[PDB]
Amino acid sequence: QYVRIKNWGSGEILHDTLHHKATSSIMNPKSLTRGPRDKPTPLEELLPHAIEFINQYYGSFKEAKIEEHLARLEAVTKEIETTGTYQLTLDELIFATKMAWRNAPRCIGRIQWSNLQVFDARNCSTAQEMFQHICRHILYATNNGNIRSAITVFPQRSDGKHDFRLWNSQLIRYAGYQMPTIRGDAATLEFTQLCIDLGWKPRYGRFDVLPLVLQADGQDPEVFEIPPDLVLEVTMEHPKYEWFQELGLKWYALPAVANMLLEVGGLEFPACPFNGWYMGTEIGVRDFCDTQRYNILEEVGRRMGLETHTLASLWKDRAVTEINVAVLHSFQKQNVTIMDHHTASESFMKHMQNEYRARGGCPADWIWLVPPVSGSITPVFHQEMLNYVLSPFYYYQIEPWKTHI
Amino acid sequence: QYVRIKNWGSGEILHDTLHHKATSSIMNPKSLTRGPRDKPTPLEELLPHAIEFINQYYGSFKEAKIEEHLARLEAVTKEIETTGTYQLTLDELIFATKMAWRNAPRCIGRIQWSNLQVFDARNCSTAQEMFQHICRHILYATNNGNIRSAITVFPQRSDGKHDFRLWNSQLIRYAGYQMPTIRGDAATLEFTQLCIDLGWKPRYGRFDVLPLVLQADGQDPEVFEIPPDLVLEVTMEHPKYEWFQELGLKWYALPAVANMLLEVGGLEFPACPFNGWYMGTEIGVRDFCDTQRYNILEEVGRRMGLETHTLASLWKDRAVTEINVAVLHSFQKQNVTIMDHHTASESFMKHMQNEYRARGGCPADWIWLVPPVSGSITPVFHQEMLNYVLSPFYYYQIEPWKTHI
Ligand code: MH0
Numbered sequence: 057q058y059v060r061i062k063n064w065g066s067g068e069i070l071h072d073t074l075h076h077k078a079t080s081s082i083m084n085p086k087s088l089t090r091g092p093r094d095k096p097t098p099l100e101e102l103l104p105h106a107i108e109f110i111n112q113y114y115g116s117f118k119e120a121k122i123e124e125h126l127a128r129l130e131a132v133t134k135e136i137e138t139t140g141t142y143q144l145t146l147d148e149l150i151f152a153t154k155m156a157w158r159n160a161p162r163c164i165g166r167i168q169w170s171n172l173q174v175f176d177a178r179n180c181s182t183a184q185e186m187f188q189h190i191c192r193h194i195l196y197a198t199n200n201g202n203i204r205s206a207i208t209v210f211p212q213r214s215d216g217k218h219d220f221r222l223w224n225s226q227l228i229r230y231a232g233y234q235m236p237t238i239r240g241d242a243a244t245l246e247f248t249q250l251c252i253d254l255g256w257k258p259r260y261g262r263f264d265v266l267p268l269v270l271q272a273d274g275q276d277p278e279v280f281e282i283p284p285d286l287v288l289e290v291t292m293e294h295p296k297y298e299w300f301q302e303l304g305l306k307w308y309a310l311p312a313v314a315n316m317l318l319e320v321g322g323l324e325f326p327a328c329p330f331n332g333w334y335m336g337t338e339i340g341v342r343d344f345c346d347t348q349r350y351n352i353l354e355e356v357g358r359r360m361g362l363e364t365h366t367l368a369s370l371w372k373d374r375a376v377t378e379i380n381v382a383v384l385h386s387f388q389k390q391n392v393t394i395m396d397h398h399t400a401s402e403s404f405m406k407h408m409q410n411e412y413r414a415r416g417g418c419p420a421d422w423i424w425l426v427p428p429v430s431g432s433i434t435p436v437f438h439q440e441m442l443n444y445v446l447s448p449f450y451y452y453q454i455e456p457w458k459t460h461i
Numbered sequence: 462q463y464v465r466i467k468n469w470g471s472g473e474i475l476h477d478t479l480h481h482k483a484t485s486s487i488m489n490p491k492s493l494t495r496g497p498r499d500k501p502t503p504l505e506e507l508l509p510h511a512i513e514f515i516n517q518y519y520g521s522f523k524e525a526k527i528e529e530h531l532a533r534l535e536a537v538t539k540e541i542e543t544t545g546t547y548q549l550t551l552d553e554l555i556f557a558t559k560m561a562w563r564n565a566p567r568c569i570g571r572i573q574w575s576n577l578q579v580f581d582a583r584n585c586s587t588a589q590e591m592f593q594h595i596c597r598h599i600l601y602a603t604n605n606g607n608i609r610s611a612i613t614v615f616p617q618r619s620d621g622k623h624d625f626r627l628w629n630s631q632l633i634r635y636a637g638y639q640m641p642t643i644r645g646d647a648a649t650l651e652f653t654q655l656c657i658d659l660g661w662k663p664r665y666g667r668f669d670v671l672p673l674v675l676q677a678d679g680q681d682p683e684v685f686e687i688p689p690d691l692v693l694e695v696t697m698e699h700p701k702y703e704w705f706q707e708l709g710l711k712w713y714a715l716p717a718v719a720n721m722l723l724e725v726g727g728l729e730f731p732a733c734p735f736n737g738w739y740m741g742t743e744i745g746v747r748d749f750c751d752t753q754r755y756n757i758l759e760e761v762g763r764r765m766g767l768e769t770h771t772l773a774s775l776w777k778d779r780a781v782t783e784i785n786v787a788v789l790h791s792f793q794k795q796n797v798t799i800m801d802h803h804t805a806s807e808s809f810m811k812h813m814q815n816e817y818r819a820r821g822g823c824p825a826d827w828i829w830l831v832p833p834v835s836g837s838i839t840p841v842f843h844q845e846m847l848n849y850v851l852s853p854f855y856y857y858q859i860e861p862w863k864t865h866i
């Protein structure tokens with residue numbers, strides 16, 4: 057069967073068949089969260105999940121590998137009977153990570169899905185070994201500002217009481233402090249409190265990089281400071297407004313999300329931080345202009361000398377645009393990979409067209425793929441989308457501090 | 462029971478209970494369309510629909526009217542047994558129209574829901590009487606540019622073969638012609654063809670107001686030209702860019718949608734055109750800047766002397782903003798009611814807060830309530846919403862030319 061979807065700009069029609077392979081405006085709906093266990097994954101659930109994955113994998117090549125396909129089926133089964141689980145071949149993992157990314161309905165850069173570097177840290181055992189792996193990560197991805205997509209996969213959930221887990225929301229992330237006002241990133245107020253509760257030394261700034269809070273093999277969490285030589289940053293200049301530097305703003309160059317779970321073949325890797333690179337509006341519009349974060353918009357408004365007291369003047373529409381201009385300009389001047397949202401949007405549309413011919417669909421969350429400024433000016437606004445959870449997948453998780461033992 | 466929803470800006474939480482009273486990114490999903498019948502509405506369906514409505518109605522006052530409530534229950538029933546349907550008291554209709562509007566999940570102006578003027582034309586019998594009613598409408602609403610919300614309700618669907626139906630998508634709407642290119646509003650190309658097929662005289666302009674194509678008591682459709690004295694328009698001036706007038710643009714002042722069905726109390730009024738007033742971005746961003754309509758954006762780009770050949774320059778973000786500035790400025794100069802999207806957004810948020818205390822919910826379609834430019838700058842972006850179909854309701858319908866008999 058299938059579902060007809062229309063792009064209202066080009067008038068083009070597309071038929072979705074891929075949604076049949078799905079599973080069972082809210083930001084964190086339960087359907088997108090994968091929570092804790094306290095007992096291993098039942099064998100009858102696990103086995104056909106594994107068999108299906110192994111078939112996806114061996115079903116991806118141009119030349120079938122029916123011998124090793126058949127061999128890997130038996131091998132995987134025998135392993136599950138004898139050990140109660142299994143381990144993925146390195147190529148399987150690589151394939152899983154790119155696939156899960158391919159299946160991230162809230163991501164706009166998925167034209168890049170087969171261009172990812174994978175770090176196998178499935179043999180990590182302690183917090184300090186995590187912290188070293190994360191440091192290798194931050195350094196590989198950052199590449200002196202020529203950002204590279206990478207993921208570090210840590211040991212899979214086994215029984216569920218030995219979970220490896222980054223407590224951070226992103227690898228680099230500015231601290232936010234309540235004050236004697238709020239200084240820094242107000243979004244990380246509660247998490248900053250947590251770092252302080254665990255002995256981290258607050259420096260009370262607007263751009264103080266938070267510490268990695270790591271938990272290995274179910275252990276209690278240990279606090280690590282990131283070597284500032286590793287954290288690359290971009291100071292904000294506007295290419296015509298000389299006064300923009302006086303706002304004294306910067307942002308980190310590495311958008312690396314830390315707290316999501318990779319589901320694959322019946323397995324769960326609750327620690328698999330990954331990174332892409334920035335799309336300007338994340339910093340320009342969300343980080344700098346959300347009232348709940350930094351909230352510069354009224355100030356850039358006042359310094360442009362606009363009528364910031366009458367909404368019908370569209371001064372907000374003029375301010376934010378220049379801020380976006382600041383960010384894109386500052387990233388290019390200092391050689392840090394970035395993409396403006398117009399370009400990203402056209403890129404995604406190309407991807408979708410490629411994904412529909414290749415496999416008859418592309419899961420997509422309109423509410424996320426449309427930029428937070430200039431919606432209908434981008435082509436993604438006009439494209440109808442179906443949103444569905446396939447496998448593998450990157451799920452959200454419950455905040456570990458609400459469930460630590 | 463209930464559902465928890467978060468506003469991520471204020472951090473405020475709201476509990477939705479109203480969704481329990483619901484019924485059974487795609488623009489026209491079937492769940493939002495109410496199509497044709499060929500036999501009357503079965504009595505067993507109709508009766509509890511009517512009883513429920515009558516209870517909603519008599520349940521709305523501060524002082525109960527239990528006698529007339531009870532009386533109206535019997536009266537309505539007796540009428541349905543004897544006549545196979547019923548007729549609403551004028552106050553019932555008024556109440557129904559405002560309620561259905563209150564229940565329009567894709568509308569942003571609903572703080573105005575109890576401020577509507579109702580024209581009872583349920584006794585219309587012929588096309589010419591429709592056309593006169595529509596003319597009274599256009600004239601009342603337009604009010605010399607001080608726009609007033611109004612609706613004209615025509616006779617309810619009875620058997621389903623005598624349906625009253627406006628074939629227009631809106632009352633005022635510019636024509637679009639294929640050319641020896643495309644001139645005018647490309648969105649109304651197919652409908653313009655239809656008007657021409659029925660004898661209307663094409664004038665081949667960019668802003669030629671289309672004719673009302675009316676169908677009464679199931680009859681074939683008759684074509685009427687709207688008296689230009691009734692169609693009020695705003696010519697576009699930019700208050701700093703002298704060259705904006707040379708684009709030679711204007712738009713009509715009356716946004717009046719013609720083709721939706723009012724469902725109420727088991728009844729269907731397939732002809733009930735209504736109007737509000739404009740929110741700038743409809744004209745500024747959609748009508749003028751959608752590639753599929755008018756598509757001025759590259760031209761205003763070139764005349765601003767911006768680098769319209771490099772997307773990372775954000776020239777699209779600068780152009781569109783000024784166009785929005787043109788529209789808002791031209792409507793105010795010429796005394797035509799209009800509202801900018803920042804203001805509308807704050808207005809809706811106030812409404813939602815009022816709707817949740819008053820009746821524990823507000824149906825809402827995020828994908829529609831968020832303006833097509835400057836999403837996260839408006840508060841509506843950050844508010845989680847639940848979208849559900851209540852009753853009464855304004856449904857979409859199937860294009861009548863695909864089903865005319
Ligand atoms: C393999 C993992 C992965 C990689 C690599 C990846 C690479 C990239 N991404 Fe992107 N992307 C990935 C998976 C996601 C997820 C799962 C989400 C949504 C997560 C969430 O709920 O916050 C996401 N990406 C979300 C986003 C968002 C929006 C985030 C937000 O607004 O909060 C952007 C702009 C984005 N991406 C762009 C990009 C770009 C550009 C690249 C590089 C080409």
Ligand code: MH0
Binds near residue numbers: 611
């Ligand atoms: C009682 C009927 C009704 C009235 C009166 C009404 C009055 C108003 N409205 Fe609004 N509104 C109504 C019911 C709707 C519907 C049913 C829709 C969506 C219809 C559709 O699918 O195209 C809608 N309104 C849609 C809209 C839209 C978006 C339309 C689009 O993008 O295509 C806007 C901007 C809007 N309104 C604003 C307003 C304003 C401002 C007022 C005046 C206060």
Ligand SMILES: C[C@H](O)[C@H](O)[C@H]1CNc2nc(N)[nH]c(=O)c2N1
Binds near residue numbers: 082469842
């Ligand atoms: C409430 C609403 O879902 C929320 O604000 C969403 C909107 N769409 C988004 N889209 C992206 N890319 N990132 C976000 O954080 C959000 N937030």
Ligand SMILES: C[C@H](O)[C@H](O)[C@H]1CNc2nc(N)[nH]c(=O)c2N1
Binds near residue numbers: 064488
């Ligand atoms: C495909 C997508 O649903 C479509 O472009 C929608 C998006 N949201 C909208 N919102 C409004 N107000 N009006 C519209 O026409 C649309 N179109």
